[PDB]
Amino acid sequence: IDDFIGSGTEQVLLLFKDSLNSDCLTSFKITDLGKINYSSENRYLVVPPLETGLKVCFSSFRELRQHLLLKEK
């Protein structure tokens, strides 16, 4: 588990069995479990805005909690 691409984000490296070859790191599998996937656009269009929506909604939530403590005071 580490960043082998040099994106910043961690990836998982999976090494399949040594029965294939008497050679190290042949038969690899590199994946992020999102977009990055190496080995041996309507979908990809709507996720960032929806995530930003979640973040804005989270900010509002927290703001209202603060507003409510003020009124109690």
Partner 1 sequence: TLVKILHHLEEPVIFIGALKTEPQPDEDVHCDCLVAFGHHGRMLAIKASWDESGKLVPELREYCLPGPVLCAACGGGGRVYHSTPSDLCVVDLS
Partner 2 sequence: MAVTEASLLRQCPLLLPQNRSKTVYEGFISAQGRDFHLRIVLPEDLQLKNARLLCSWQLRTILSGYHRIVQQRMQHSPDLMSFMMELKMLLEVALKNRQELYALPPPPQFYSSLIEEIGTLGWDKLVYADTCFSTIKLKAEDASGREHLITLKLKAKYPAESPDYFVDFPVPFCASWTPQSSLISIYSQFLAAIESLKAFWDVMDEIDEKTWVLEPEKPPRSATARRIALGNNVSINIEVDPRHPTMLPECFFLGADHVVKPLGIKLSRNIHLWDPENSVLQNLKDVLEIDFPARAILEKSDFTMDCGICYAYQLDGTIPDQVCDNSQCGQPFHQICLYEWLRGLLTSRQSFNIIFGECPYCSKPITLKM
**Do residues 32 and 11 touch, judged by C-beta distance below 8 A?**
yes
Q: Does 33 bind partner 2 (CB under 8 A)?
A: no
Q: Does 58 bind partner 1 (CB under 8 A)?
A: yes
The one segment of 14-22, 30-38, 39-47, 59-67 that binds partner 1 by CB under 8 A:
59-67
Work out how close the CB of 34 gets to partner 2 at its nearest, in angstroms, rounded to a whole number: 17
Name the DSSP letter for residue 16: -
Q: Which residues bind to partner 1, rule: CB under 8 A?
A: 8, 55, 58-59, 62-63
